[PDB]
Amino acid sequence: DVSFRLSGADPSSYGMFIKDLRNALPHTEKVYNIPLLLPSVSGAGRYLLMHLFNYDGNTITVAVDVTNVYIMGYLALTTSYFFNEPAADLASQYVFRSARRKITLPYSGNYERLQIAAGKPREKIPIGLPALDTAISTLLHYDSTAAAGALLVLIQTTAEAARFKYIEQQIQERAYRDEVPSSATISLENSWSGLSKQIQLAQGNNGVFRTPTVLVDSKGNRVQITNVTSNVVTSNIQLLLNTKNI
Ligand SMILES: *[C@@H]1O[C@H](CO)[C@@H](O)[C@H](O)[C@H]1NC(C)=O
Numbered sequence: 575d576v577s578f579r580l581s582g583a584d585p586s587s588y589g590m591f592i593k594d595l596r597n598a599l600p601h602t603e604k605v606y607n608i609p610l611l612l613p614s615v616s617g618a619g620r621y622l623l624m625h626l627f628n629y630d631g632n633t634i635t636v637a638v639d640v641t642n643v644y645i646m647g648y649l650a651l652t653t654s655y656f657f658n659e660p661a662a663d664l665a666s667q668y669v670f671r672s673a674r675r676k677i678t679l680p681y682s683g684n685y686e687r688l689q690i691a692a693g694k695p696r697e698k699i700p701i702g703l704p705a706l707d708t709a710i711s712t713l714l715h716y717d718s719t720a721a722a723g724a725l726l727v728l729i730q731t732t733a734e735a736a737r738f739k740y741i742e743q744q745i746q747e748r749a750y751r752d753e754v755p756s757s758a759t760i761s762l763e764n765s766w767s768g769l770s771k772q773i774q775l776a777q778g779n780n781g782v783f784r785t786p787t788v789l790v791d792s793k794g795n796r797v798q799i800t801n802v803t804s805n806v807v808t809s810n811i812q813l814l815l816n817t818k819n820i
Contacts, residue, residue, distance in 0.1 A: 576623075578627070599611060600615070606773060608807070622640050630711075633710075634714065635648060639661065644683060646661060650715070652675070654666065658682055697757075700748075701744075704750070705731070705752045736813060761789045769799070776801065783799065
């Protein structure tokens with residue numbers, strides 16, 4: 575398991591949590607020195623548990639699929655909650671089985687569905703450590719509309735930060751003040767699968783992408799990533815979605 579406590583949290587302790595999260599995901603090989611997530615894991619070993627504690631010390635446990643860093647569900651006191659999707663239902667066969675009751679959320683875990691449920695795009699939802707504190711607190715008691723926004727915050731401040739150093743740094747900058755994600759942050763989130771694929775395809779193609787990936791940079795400028803010498807590949811991305819899952 576991995577843990578993070580909002581009480582006394584700072585950029586360093588958050589950085590340690592994101593390091594722990596990354597290090598808890600298994601891999602047998604690296605591609606261009608980036609860990610390649612496994613094609614599959616059978617049984618309960620597929621799921622990592624993240625223990626998150628809000629400022630008051632109340633906690634939820636979040637179940638994460640270690641092959642794709644997708645959040646499947648979470649436990650709050652004696653109630654488990656899972657996304658309304660086959661991968662999440664499968665996860666519910668292995669984690670939080672001791673919950674007194676299980677609620678299936680009225681949406682799947684993908685960004686478009688969560689944004690519909692929340693009533694707003696994540697362009698408009700502030701993120702940061704204070705927002706994460708709020709998100710944990712919200713998830714402690716069932717409210718499906720509120721939970722959608724909370725889960726958008728949760729996914730970005732955990733999984734997406736694990737996947738991209740830039741996003742981790744963006745949250746560290748929001749340690750004591752929330753701010754909506756940069757357009758670059760959104761671009762990277764939307765491009766993780768694509769980047770992961772092209773970095774793997776580059777292995778037998780002299781480091782060259784078969785298809786360029788279009789991103790937005792830190793200054794709001796759109797750019798094409800064409801090969802593995804790009805800063806996105808050398809410095810930023812920290813985990814690759816296995817092409818067998820793309
Ligand atoms: C590879 O990417 C670099 C740096 O982003 C770029 O300047 C260059 O034109 C690209 N080279 C090839 C062969 O695609």
